[PDB]
Protein backbone atom coordinates (compact mmCIF):
# COMPACT_ATOMS: atom_id res chain seq x y z
CA UNK A 1 0.00 0.00 0.00
CA UNK A 2 1.03 3.65 -0.04
CA UNK A 3 3.21 5.18 2.64
CA UNK A 4 3.94 8.76 3.70
CA UNK A 5 6.42 10.79 5.69
CA UNK A 6 5.78 14.30 7.01
CA UNK A 7 7.54 16.86 9.06
CA UNK A 8 5.16 19.35 10.67
CA UNK A 9 6.99 22.41 12.05
CA UNK A 10 5.80 25.43 14.01
CA UNK A 11 7.54 28.62 15.21
CA UNK A 12 5.55 30.96 17.47
CA UNK A 13 7.07 34.37 18.36
CA UNK A 14 6.59 35.63 21.88
CA UNK A 15 6.06 39.29 22.85
CA UNK A 16 8.64 39.21 25.64
CA UNK A 17 12.35 38.58 25.70
CA UNK A 18 12.06 34.92 24.67
CA UNK A 19 12.99 33.76 21.17
CA UNK A 20 10.26 31.95 19.20
CA UNK A 21 9.06 28.56 20.35
CA UNK A 22 10.14 26.06 17.61
CA UNK A 23 8.71 22.55 17.44
CA UNK A 24 9.21 19.89 14.77
CA UNK A 25 7.33 16.61 14.60
CA UNK A 26 8.09 13.80 12.11
CA UNK A 27 5.42 11.25 11.07
CA UNK A 28 5.70 7.96 9.19
CA UNK A 29 2.29 6.78 7.96
CA UNK A 30 0.73 9.35 10.28
CA UNK A 31 2.48 7.98 13.39
CA UNK A 32 4.70 10.37 15.29
CA UNK A 33 8.31 9.09 15.27
CA UNK A 34 10.51 12.03 16.12
CA UNK A 35 10.08 15.37 17.86
CA UNK A 36 12.15 18.48 18.63
CA UNK A 37 11.00 21.22 21.03
CA UNK A 38 13.14 24.35 21.73
CA UNK A 39 11.46 24.66 25.18
CA UNK A 40 12.83 21.26 26.42
CA UNK A 41 15.53 21.40 29.06
CA UNK A 42 17.92 19.86 26.57
CA UNK A 43 16.55 20.74 23.13
CA UNK A 44 17.18 17.83 20.75
CA UNK A 45 15.42 15.57 18.38
CA UNK A 46 14.12 12.54 20.29
CA UNK A 47 12.77 9.16 19.19
CA UNK A 48 8.96 8.86 19.56
CA UNK A 49 8.49 5.32 18.31
CA UNK A 50 10.49 2.22 19.56
CA UNK A 51 11.90 1.36 16.17
CA UNK A 52 13.80 4.71 15.87
CA UNK A 53 16.24 3.31 18.45
CA UNK A 54 18.08 1.72 15.45
CA UNK A 55 19.70 5.07 14.61
CA UNK A 56 23.15 5.87 16.10
CA UNK A 57 24.13 9.00 18.03
CA UNK A 58 25.24 10.79 14.84
CA UNK A 59 21.65 10.61 13.52
CA UNK A 60 20.35 12.47 16.63
CA UNK A 61 23.33 14.86 16.72
CA UNK A 62 23.04 15.95 13.09
CA UNK A 63 19.24 16.11 13.12
CA UNK A 64 19.52 18.26 16.21
CA UNK A 65 21.95 20.59 14.46
CA UNK A 66 19.52 20.70 11.56
CA UNK A 67 16.67 21.76 13.92
CA UNK A 68 18.94 24.42 15.39
CA UNK A 69 19.43 25.78 11.83
CA UNK A 70 15.64 25.61 11.16
CA UNK A 71 15.00 27.47 14.34
CA UNK A 72 17.15 30.40 13.09
CA UNK A 73 15.47 30.15 9.71
CA UNK A 74 12.03 30.46 11.26
CA UNK A 75 13.18 33.33 13.49
CA UNK A 76 14.42 35.26 10.44
CA UNK A 77 11.34 34.38 8.44
CA UNK A 78 8.98 35.50 11.19
CA UNK A 79 10.79 38.86 11.41
CA UNK A 80 10.57 39.31 7.64
CA UNK A 81 6.86 38.55 7.59
CA UNK A 82 6.30 40.97 10.41
CA UNK A 83 7.69 43.67 8.03
CA UNK A 84 5.81 42.42 4.94
CA UNK A 85 2.46 42.72 6.74
CA UNK A 86 3.43 45.92 8.72
CA UNK A 87 2.46 44.28 12.04
CA UNK A 88 3.19 45.76 15.53
CA UNK A 89 6.28 44.66 17.43
CA UNK A 90 4.77 43.31 20.67
CA UNK A 91 2.53 40.58 19.33
CA UNK A 92 2.60 36.84 18.86
CA UNK A 93 2.72 35.25 15.35
CA UNK A 94 2.70 31.66 14.04
CA UNK A 95 4.58 30.25 11.10
CA UNK A 96 4.03 26.60 10.15
CA UNK A 97 5.50 24.22 7.59
CA UNK A 98 4.41 20.83 6.26
CA UNK A 99 6.95 18.87 4.22
CA UNK A 100 7.14 15.32 2.93
CA UNK A 101 6.36 12.60 0.45
CA UNK A 102 3.77 9.98 -0.50
CA UNK A 103 5.20 6.78 -1.88
CA UNK A 104 3.67 3.78 -3.68
CA UNK A 105 4.43 0.17 -2.74
CA UNK A 106 6.90 0.25 -5.69
CA UNK A 107 8.71 3.16 -3.79
CA UNK A 108 7.87 5.63 -6.53
CA UNK A 109 7.39 9.21 -5.34
CA UNK A 110 3.67 9.94 -5.89
CA UNK A 111 3.74 13.46 -4.55
CA UNK A 112 6.06 15.83 -2.71
CA UNK A 113 4.82 18.59 -0.36
CA UNK A 114 6.48 21.77 0.81
CA UNK A 115 4.10 24.38 2.15
CA UNK A 116 3.67 27.07 4.74
CA UNK A 117 1.02 28.94 6.70
CA UNK A 118 1.23 32.22 8.54
CA UNK A 119 -1.29 33.05 11.25
CA UNK A 120 -3.31 29.99 10.25
CA UNK A 121 -3.70 30.87 6.55
CA UNK A 122 -1.96 29.26 3.59
CA UNK A 123 1.06 31.44 2.66
CA UNK A 124 3.09 29.62 0.02
CA UNK A 125 3.30 26.09 -1.38
CA UNK A 126 5.50 24.24 -3.81
CA UNK A 127 3.41 23.00 -6.70
CA UNK A 128 3.12 19.36 -7.70
CA UNK A 129 5.79 19.90 -10.44
CA UNK A 130 8.30 20.60 -7.62
CA UNK A 131 9.41 23.59 -9.66
CA UNK A 132 6.99 26.47 -9.23
CA UNK A 133 5.32 28.12 -6.28
CA UNK A 134 1.73 29.17 -5.47
CA UNK A 135 1.65 32.24 -3.25
CA UNK A 136 -1.59 33.10 -1.46
CA UNK A 137 -1.27 36.87 -0.74
CA UNK A 138 0.77 40.03 -1.30
CA UNK A 139 3.49 39.18 1.19
CA UNK A 140 3.91 35.67 -0.21
CA UNK A 141 4.56 37.13 -3.69
CA UNK A 142 7.65 38.75 -2.09
CA UNK A 143 8.75 35.38 -0.80
CA UNK A 144 7.88 33.73 -4.16
CA UNK A 145 10.01 36.18 -6.14
CA UNK A 146 12.89 35.74 -3.68
CA UNK A 147 12.75 31.97 -3.95
CA UNK A 148 12.42 32.06 -7.74
CA UNK A 149 15.60 34.24 -7.93
CA UNK A 150 17.63 32.02 -5.59
CA UNK A 151 16.54 28.74 -7.18
CA UNK A 152 15.00 27.49 -3.89
CA UNK A 153 12.60 24.97 -5.55
CA UNK A 154 15.52 22.91 -6.84
CA UNK A 155 16.76 22.35 -3.29
CA UNK A 156 13.29 21.23 -2.10
CA UNK A 157 12.81 19.06 -5.18
CA UNK A 158 16.15 17.31 -4.34
CA UNK A 159 15.06 16.72 -0.75
CA UNK A 160 11.61 15.43 -1.74
CA UNK A 161 12.77 13.03 -4.50
CA UNK A 162 15.96 11.91 -2.74
CA UNK A 163 16.21 11.98 1.03
CA UNK A 164 12.50 12.02 1.79
CA UNK A 165 11.96 8.78 -0.30
CA UNK A 166 15.12 7.03 0.87
CA UNK A 167 14.74 7.72 4.58
CA UNK A 168 11.02 6.83 4.52
CA UNK A 169 12.02 3.46 3.03
CA UNK A 170 14.64 2.89 5.72
CA UNK A 171 12.13 3.86 8.48
CA UNK A 172 9.47 1.45 7.11
CA UNK A 173 11.98 -1.45 7.08
CA UNK A 174 13.02 -0.71 10.68
CA UNK A 175 9.46 0.06 11.82
CA UNK A 176 7.58 -2.65 9.96
CA UNK A 177 6.45 -5.00 12.77
CA UNK A 178 5.52 -2.12 15.09
CA UNK A 179 3.76 -0.10 12.30
CA UNK A 180 1.50 -3.09 11.57
CA UNK A 181 0.37 -3.33 15.26
CA UNK A 182 -3.36 -2.99 15.93
CA UNK A 183 -5.69 -3.07 18.97
CA UNK A 184 -9.28 -3.93 18.04
CA UNK A 185 -12.18 -1.79 19.20
CA UNK A 186 -14.50 -3.10 21.88
CA UNK A 187 -18.02 -1.97 21.07
CA UNK A 188 -21.30 -1.63 22.86
CA UNK A 189 -24.57 0.29 22.51
CA UNK A 190 -26.11 2.48 25.24
CA UNK A 191 -29.71 3.65 25.44
CA UNK A 192 -30.55 7.17 26.63
CA UNK A 193 -34.15 8.33 26.83
CA UNK A 194 -35.04 11.86 25.68
CA UNK A 195 -38.30 13.83 25.35
CA UNK A 196 -41.48 13.08 23.37
CA UNK A 197 -41.06 9.27 23.12
CA UNK A 198 -37.60 9.26 21.48
CA UNK A 199 -34.35 7.69 22.53
CA UNK A 200 -30.69 8.25 21.72
CA UNK A 201 -28.83 5.05 20.84
CA UNK A 202 -25.06 5.59 21.22
CA UNK A 203 -22.69 3.17 19.67
CA UNK A 204 -19.27 3.15 21.42
CA UNK A 205 -15.92 1.90 20.22
CA UNK A 206 -13.15 1.78 22.81
CA UNK A 207 -9.51 0.82 23.20
CA UNK A 208 -8.57 0.74 19.50
CA UNK A 209 -5.37 1.57 17.61
CA UNK A 210 -4.68 3.10 15.10
CA UNK A 211 -7.18 5.98 15.26
CA UNK A 212 -8.83 5.31 11.85
CA UNK A 213 -12.31 3.85 12.32
CA UNK A 214 -15.76 4.00 10.87
CA UNK A 215 -19.03 3.68 12.77
CA UNK A 216 -22.37 3.49 10.98
CA UNK A 217 -25.96 3.07 12.03
CA UNK A 218 -28.51 1.27 10.02
CA UNK A 219 -32.18 0.46 9.90
CA UNK A 220 -33.70 -2.38 7.93
CA UNK A 221 -30.51 -2.68 5.90
CA UNK A 222 -30.16 0.97 5.01
CA UNK A 223 -27.35 3.12 6.34
CA UNK A 224 -28.54 6.21 8.19
CA UNK A 225 -27.73 9.96 7.79
CA UNK A 226 -30.29 12.16 9.61
CA UNK A 227 -30.82 12.41 13.40
CA UNK A 228 -27.18 11.32 13.64
CA UNK A 229 -24.17 12.58 15.61
CA UNK A 230 -20.57 11.56 15.60
CA UNK A 231 -17.84 12.78 17.99
CA UNK A 232 -14.32 13.35 16.79
CA UNK A 233 -12.07 10.32 17.49
CA UNK A 234 -10.30 11.01 20.82
CA UNK A 235 -7.29 9.59 22.64
CA UNK A 236 -7.92 7.57 25.87
CA UNK A 237 -4.46 8.70 26.97
CA UNK A 238 -2.90 5.26 27.05
CA UNK A 239 -2.10 5.10 23.30
CA UNK A 240 -5.60 3.75 22.30
CA UNK A 241 -8.57 5.72 20.95
CA UNK A 242 -12.33 6.11 21.47
CA UNK A 243 -15.32 7.17 19.36
CA UNK A 244 -19.06 7.07 19.38
CA UNK A 245 -21.90 7.58 16.97
CA UNK A 246 -25.53 8.12 17.90
CA UNK A 247 -28.96 8.08 16.29
CA UNK A 248 -32.29 9.36 17.69
CA UNK A 249 -35.02 6.71 17.25
CA UNK A 250 -38.65 6.06 18.29
CA UNK A 251 -39.22 4.40 21.68
CA UNK A 252 -40.30 0.77 21.03
CA UNK A 253 -38.20 0.48 17.82
CA UNK A 254 -34.67 0.53 19.32
CA UNK A 255 -33.83 -3.08 18.62
CA UNK A 256 -34.46 -2.54 14.86
CA UNK A 257 -31.25 -0.44 14.66
CA UNK A 258 -27.76 -1.86 14.28
CA UNK A 259 -24.36 -0.25 14.57
CA UNK A 260 -21.42 -1.41 12.48
CA UNK A 261 -17.79 -0.90 13.49
CA UNK A 262 -15.10 -0.94 10.84
CA UNK A 263 -11.52 -1.16 11.98
CA UNK A 264 -8.31 -2.68 10.46
CA UNK A 265 -7.56 -4.68 13.66
CA UNK A 266 -10.80 -6.66 13.34
CA UNK A 267 -11.06 -10.00 11.57
CA UNK A 268 -14.40 -8.60 10.23
CA UNK A 269 -16.57 -5.55 11.04
CA UNK A 270 -18.52 -5.70 14.31
CA UNK A 271 -22.23 -5.54 14.16
CA UNK A 272 -24.23 -4.83 17.27
CA UNK A 273 -27.47 -3.68 18.65
CA UNK A 274 -28.88 -2.39 21.89
CA UNK A 275 -29.02 -5.50 24.13
CA UNK A 276 -31.17 -4.55 27.18
CA UNK B 1 15.22 12.89 8.00
CA UNK B 2 13.89 16.44 8.14
CA UNK B 3 14.07 19.20 5.47
CA UNK B 4 16.80 21.81 5.77
CA UNK B 5 15.22 25.00 4.42
CA UNK B 6 17.20 27.23 2.03
CA UNK B 7 16.40 30.95 1.56
CA UNK B 8 14.38 32.64 4.27
CA UNK B 9 10.89 34.02 3.55
Amino acid at each position, epitope marked *: GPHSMRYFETAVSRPGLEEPRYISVGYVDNKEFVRFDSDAENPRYEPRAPWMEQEGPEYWE*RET*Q*KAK*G*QE*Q*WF*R*VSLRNLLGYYNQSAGGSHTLQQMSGCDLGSDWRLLRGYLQFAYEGRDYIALNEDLKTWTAADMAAQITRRKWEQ*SGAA*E*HYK*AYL*E*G*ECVEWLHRYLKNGNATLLRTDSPKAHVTHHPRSKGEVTLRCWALGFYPADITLTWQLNGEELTQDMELVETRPAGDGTFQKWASVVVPLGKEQNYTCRVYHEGLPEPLTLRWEP | KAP*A*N*F*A*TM
Partner: T-cell receptor
Amino acid sequence: QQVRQSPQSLTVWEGGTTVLTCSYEDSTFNYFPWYQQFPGEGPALLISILSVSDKKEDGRFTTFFNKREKKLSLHIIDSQPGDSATYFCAALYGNEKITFGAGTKLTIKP
Amino acid sequence: AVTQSPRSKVAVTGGKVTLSCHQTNNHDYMYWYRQDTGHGLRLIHYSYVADSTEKGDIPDGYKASRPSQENFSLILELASLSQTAVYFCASSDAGGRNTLYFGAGTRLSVLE
Protein backbone atom coordinates in the same frame (compact mmCIF):
# COMPACT_ATOMS: atom_id res chain seq x y z
CA GLN C 1 39.95 17.39 7.14
CA GLN C 2 36.85 16.75 5.16
CA VAL C 3 37.41 18.44 1.77
CA ARG C 4 40.77 17.67 0.18
CA GLN C 5 41.84 20.06 -2.59
CA SER C 6 45.06 19.67 -4.67
CA PRO C 7 47.26 20.91 -6.17
CA GLN C 8 48.28 24.06 -4.30
CA SER C 9 48.75 25.73 -7.67
CA LEU C 10 48.48 24.74 -11.29
CA THR C 11 49.29 26.35 -14.63
CA VAL C 12 47.33 25.64 -17.78
CA TRP C 13 48.12 26.95 -21.26
CA GLU C 14 45.69 29.53 -22.69
CA GLY C 15 42.94 27.86 -24.71
CA GLY C 16 43.42 24.51 -22.93
CA THR C 17 40.88 22.91 -20.61
CA THR C 18 41.68 23.28 -16.93
CA VAL C 19 40.55 20.42 -14.72
CA LEU C 20 40.42 21.12 -10.97
CA THR C 21 39.44 18.30 -8.65
CA CYS C 22 38.56 17.78 -5.00
CA SER C 23 37.70 14.80 -2.84
CA TYR C 24 35.54 14.70 0.28
CA GLU C 25 35.17 12.30 3.22
CA ASP C 26 31.50 12.63 4.34
CA SER C 27 29.42 10.60 1.90
CA THR C 28 26.24 12.41 3.18
CA PHE C 29 27.47 15.81 1.80
CA ASN C 30 24.83 16.99 -0.68
CA TYR C 31 25.64 20.56 -1.76
CA PHE C 32 28.88 21.49 -3.44
CA PRO C 33 29.62 25.12 -4.34
CA TRP C 34 32.84 26.45 -5.90
CA TYR C 35 34.11 29.88 -5.04
CA GLN C 36 36.52 31.92 -7.23
CA GLN C 37 38.87 34.48 -5.61
CA PHE C 38 40.76 36.98 -7.71
CA PRO C 39 43.95 38.57 -6.22
CA GLY C 40 43.19 41.43 -3.80
CA GLU C 41 39.45 40.57 -3.72
CA GLY C 42 37.21 38.26 -1.72
CA PRO C 43 35.88 34.89 -2.79
CA ALA C 44 32.62 34.89 -4.82
CA LEU C 45 30.24 32.01 -5.65
CA LEU C 46 31.14 30.65 -9.07
CA ILE C 47 28.86 27.65 -9.57
CA SER C 48 27.22 24.98 -7.47
CA ILE C 49 25.66 21.53 -7.75
CA LEU C 50 23.41 19.30 -5.74
CA SER C 51 24.21 15.59 -5.18
CA VAL C 52 21.06 14.53 -7.19
CA SER C 53 22.88 15.88 -10.31
CA ASP C 54 25.95 14.77 -12.29
CA LYS C 55 26.84 18.10 -13.82
CA LYS C 56 26.06 21.80 -13.96
CA GLU C 57 27.24 24.05 -16.82
CA ASP C 58 27.30 27.86 -17.00
CA GLY C 59 29.11 29.29 -20.05
CA ARG C 60 32.68 27.99 -20.10
CA PHE C 61 32.50 26.52 -16.58
CA THR C 62 31.26 23.01 -15.77
CA THR C 63 31.16 21.27 -12.39
CA PHE C 64 30.95 17.47 -12.25
CA PHE C 65 29.96 15.45 -9.21
CA ASN C 66 30.80 11.77 -8.82
CA LYS C 67 29.16 10.31 -5.75
CA ARG C 68 30.68 6.86 -6.06
CA GLU C 69 34.28 8.09 -5.74
CA LYS C 70 33.36 11.14 -3.63
CA LYS C 71 35.01 13.46 -6.14
CA LEU C 72 33.99 16.87 -7.39
CA SER C 73 35.61 18.67 -10.28
CA LEU C 74 35.56 21.97 -12.17
CA HIS C 75 36.29 22.14 -15.89
CA ILE C 76 37.14 25.37 -17.63
CA ILE C 77 37.07 25.19 -21.46
CA ASP C 78 39.09 27.64 -23.55
CA SER C 79 40.96 28.93 -20.45
CA GLN C 80 41.56 32.75 -20.49
CA PRO C 81 44.19 34.75 -18.60
CA GLY C 82 41.16 36.36 -16.88
CA ASP C 83 40.36 32.96 -15.28
CA SER C 84 43.58 33.24 -13.22
CA ALA C 85 42.35 33.05 -9.63
CA THR C 86 42.18 30.79 -6.59
CA TYR C 87 39.38 28.21 -6.84
CA PHE C 88 37.86 26.82 -3.67
CA CYS C 89 35.72 23.69 -3.67
CA ALA C 90 33.39 23.26 -0.77
CA ALA C 91 30.85 20.80 0.60
CA LEU C 92 28.16 20.52 3.15
CA TYR C 93 25.12 18.52 4.27
CA GLY C 94 21.73 20.07 4.88
CA ASN C 95 22.06 23.43 6.70
CA GLU C 96 25.37 22.54 8.32
CA LYS C 97 28.29 24.98 7.98
CA ILE C 98 30.23 25.01 4.73
CA THR C 99 33.61 23.19 4.62
CA PHE C 100 36.12 24.80 2.23
CA GLY C 101 39.06 23.14 0.55
CA ALA C 102 42.46 24.88 0.80
CA GLY C 103 42.06 26.34 -2.68
CA THR C 104 43.97 25.87 -5.92
CA LYS C 105 45.75 28.94 -7.40
CA LEU C 106 45.21 28.81 -11.14
CA THR C 107 47.38 30.77 -13.50
CA ILE C 108 46.55 30.67 -17.22
CA LYS C 109 49.54 31.56 -19.39
CA PRO C 110 50.10 32.01 -23.10
CA ALA D 1 27.52 44.87 -0.26
CA VAL D 2 29.98 43.66 2.34
CA THR D 3 32.75 46.16 3.07
CA GLN D 4 35.73 45.74 5.41
CA SER D 5 37.81 48.28 7.21
CA PRO D 6 40.71 48.81 7.21
CA ARG D 7 42.01 47.40 3.96
CA SER D 8 45.37 46.87 5.62
CA LYS D 9 46.65 46.90 9.16
CA VAL D 10 50.17 46.87 10.60
CA ALA D 11 50.29 46.26 14.35
CA VAL D 12 52.82 45.73 17.11
CA THR D 13 53.01 42.39 18.92
CA GLY D 14 50.88 42.73 21.96
CA GLY D 15 48.91 45.64 20.48
CA LYS D 16 45.12 45.81 20.12
CA VAL D 17 43.63 45.37 16.62
CA THR D 18 39.92 45.75 15.55
CA LEU D 19 38.85 44.71 12.05
CA SER D 20 35.43 45.99 11.07
CA CYS D 21 32.83 44.74 8.64
CA HIS D 22 29.69 46.46 7.45
CA GLN D 23 27.04 44.75 5.32
CA THR D 24 24.03 46.19 3.55
CA ASN D 25 22.49 42.80 2.58
CA ASN D 26 20.14 42.80 5.58
CA HIS D 27 21.59 39.34 6.29
CA ASP D 28 21.43 37.77 9.70
CA TYR D 29 24.52 35.55 9.54
CA MET D 30 28.02 37.16 9.57
CA TYR D 31 31.39 35.42 9.54
CA TRP D 32 35.10 36.10 9.99
CA TYR D 33 37.55 33.89 8.04
CA ARG D 34 41.33 33.56 8.03
CA GLN D 35 43.35 32.91 4.86
CA ASP D 36 47.11 32.05 4.95
CA THR D 37 49.39 32.77 1.99
CA GLY D 38 46.38 32.71 -0.33
CA HIS D 39 45.09 29.34 1.02
CA GLY D 40 42.26 28.26 3.22
CA LEU D 41 39.19 29.96 4.49
CA ARG D 42 39.21 29.11 8.18
CA LEU D 43 36.22 30.14 10.34
CA ILE D 44 37.22 32.14 13.43
CA HIS D 45 33.90 33.45 14.76
CA TYR D 46 30.42 33.93 13.42
CA SER D 47 27.04 35.30 14.53
CA TYR D 48 23.49 34.50 13.52
CA VAL D 49 21.72 37.46 15.08
CA ALA D 50 22.43 41.09 16.00
CA ASP D 51 23.89 41.50 19.47
CA SER D 52 25.36 37.95 19.91
CA THR D 53 28.25 35.84 18.63
CA GLU D 54 29.38 32.25 18.29
CA LYS D 55 32.78 30.61 18.38
CA GLY D 56 33.97 29.29 15.05
CA ASP D 57 36.63 26.65 14.49
CA ILE D 58 39.79 28.68 15.32
CA PRO D 59 38.49 31.23 17.86
CA ASP D 60 41.64 31.37 19.99
CA GLY D 61 43.32 34.76 20.13
CA TYR D 62 40.21 36.46 18.67
CA LYS D 63 37.04 38.08 20.07
CA ALA D 64 34.03 39.08 17.96
CA SER D 65 31.37 41.68 18.47
CA ARG D 66 27.99 42.06 16.68
CA PRO D 67 26.65 45.44 17.88
CA SER D 68 23.96 45.62 15.16
CA GLN D 69 22.71 43.57 12.21
CA GLU D 70 24.99 45.44 9.86
CA ASN D 71 28.26 45.29 11.82
CA PHE D 72 30.58 42.48 12.87
CA SER D 73 34.02 43.19 14.26
CA LEU D 74 37.02 40.98 14.89
CA ILE D 75 39.09 41.98 17.95
CA LEU D 76 42.65 40.80 18.67
CA GLU D 77 43.38 42.10 22.22
CA LEU D 78 47.06 41.05 22.25
CA ALA D 79 48.16 40.63 18.63
CA SER D 80 50.73 37.90 18.01
CA LEU D 81 53.13 37.16 15.13
CA SER D 82 51.05 34.10 14.18
CA GLN D 83 48.01 36.29 13.53
CA THR D 84 49.76 37.78 10.47
CA ALA D 85 47.26 36.66 7.72
CA VAL D 86 44.46 37.95 5.49
CA TYR D 87 41.00 38.17 7.02
CA PHE D 88 37.70 37.99 5.18
CA CYS D 89 34.25 39.00 6.48
CA ALA D 90 31.15 37.48 5.00
CA SER D 91 27.39 37.58 5.26
CA SER D 92 24.65 35.19 4.41
CA ASP D 93 20.85 35.08 4.58
CA ALA D 94 20.34 32.23 6.96
CA GLY D 95 23.20 29.88 6.75
CA GLY D 96 23.77 26.38 5.55
CA ARG D 97 23.37 26.36 1.74
CA ASN D 98 22.75 30.13 1.43
CA THR D 99 25.47 31.91 -0.54
CA LEU D 100 28.26 33.64 1.39
CA TYR D 101 28.92 37.17 0.29
CA PHE D 102 32.48 38.17 1.15
CA GLY D 103 34.31 41.44 1.75
CA ALA D 104 37.46 42.24 -0.21
CA GLY D 105 39.74 41.26 2.67
CA THR D 106 42.04 42.86 5.27
CA ARG D 107 45.74 42.17 5.32
CA LEU D 108 47.32 42.14 8.79
CA SER D 109 50.96 42.16 9.64
CA VAL D 110 52.03 41.93 13.28
CA LEU D 111 55.60 43.08 13.93
CA GLU D 112 57.92 43.17 16.91
